[PDB]
Design a protein around this ligand. Structure first.
Ligand SMILES: O=C(CSc1nnc(-c2ccccc2C(=O)O)[nH]1)Nc1nc2ccccc2s1
Ligand SMILES: [Cl-]
Ligand SMILES: [Cl-]
Ligand SMILES: [Cl-]
Ligand SMILES: [Zn+2]
Ligand SMILES: [Zn+2]
Ligand SMILES: [Zn+2]
Length: 235
């Protein structure tokens, strides 16, 4: 993915798409906060003549830009969206999606945590994902709950036609060698949850982190290394 869009190349408010395979793209957007600029990834998966969106692009502004970029580059309607955890980097644009007629989804756990946090709440509930190891089909992807990691509710998404594993914020890019936002993380369980992902999707060829550059399954071991090191940086 030498051409993969990087954080320093995208102005805040703009969205890039990157086609991974036939009918599979990532979306990349940047936002500035806490003194820095960060990239964020989501996924777009074609299903017939419609699109499934995985995660919004930061907030409302970026998510409007996302819908506009999808229209320009793909030109098919986004009919459903799934948010992979309750934080604003995953649900921040949910009301923009709802206003545009997109049916928004998340697990009951995500919906609950979003409400508590004061974050936008996806409309529909995804059933069958409440116990670690649970997997359910959703249109052209499989949704998997690996257990608590970056957050207690984090989901991962696999596209079996393309061998694409979207890890969300439970998986770090290689360039990140220190913990990111871990305020809601379960450090004790995070490596076990990663092990479940490895065991369930060992065939994955293209692994996309919540933020930054894609790679292969090596990203999973990398993330475990970072998480364990952070766990030991305690006192
Ligand atoms: O979503 C959160 C906090 S929870 C969270 N979940 N993931 C992150 C994250 C962020 C940057 C780099 C790495 C990570 C990570 O996954 O570790 N943070 N803050 C947001 N601030 C803004 C401001 C503007 C518009 C949208 C948003 S969303
Ligand atoms: Cl948040
Ligand atoms: Cl709806
Ligand atoms: Cl609906
Ligand atoms: Zn998060
Ligand atoms: Zn609906
Ligand atoms: Zn994140």
């Amino acid at each position: 993915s030498g051409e993969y869009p990087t954080v320093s190349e995208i102005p805040v408010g703009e969205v890039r798409l990157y086609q991974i395979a036939d009918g599979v793209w990532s979306h990349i957007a940047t936002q500035s906060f806490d003194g820095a600029v960060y990239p964020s990834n989501g996924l777009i998966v074609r299903d017939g003549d419609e699109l499934l969106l995985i995660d919004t692009a930061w907030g409302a502004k970026n998510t409007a830009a996302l819908l506009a970029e999808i229209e320009k580059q793909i030109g098919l309607p986004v009919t459903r969206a799934v948010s992979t955890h309750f934080h604003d980097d995953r649900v921040g644009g949910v009301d923009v999606l709802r206003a545009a007629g997109v049916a928004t989804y998340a697990s009951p756990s995500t919906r609950r945590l979003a409400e508590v946090e004061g974050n936008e709440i996806p409309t529909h509930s995804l059933e069958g994902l409440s116990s670690s190891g649970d997997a359910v089909r959703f249109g052209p992807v499989e949704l998997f709950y690996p257990g608590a990691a970056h957050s207690t509710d984090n989901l991962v998404v696999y596209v079996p036609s393309a061998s694409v594993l979207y890890g969300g914020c439970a998986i770090y890019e290689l360039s990140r060698t220190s913990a990111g936002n871990v305020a809601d993380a379960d450090l004790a369980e995070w490596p076990t949850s990663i092990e479940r992902i490895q065991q369930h999707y060992p065939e994955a060829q293209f692994v996309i982190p919540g933020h930054g550059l894609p790679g292969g399954l090596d990203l999973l071991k990398h993330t475990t290394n970072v998480v364990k090191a952070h766990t030991n940086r305690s006192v």
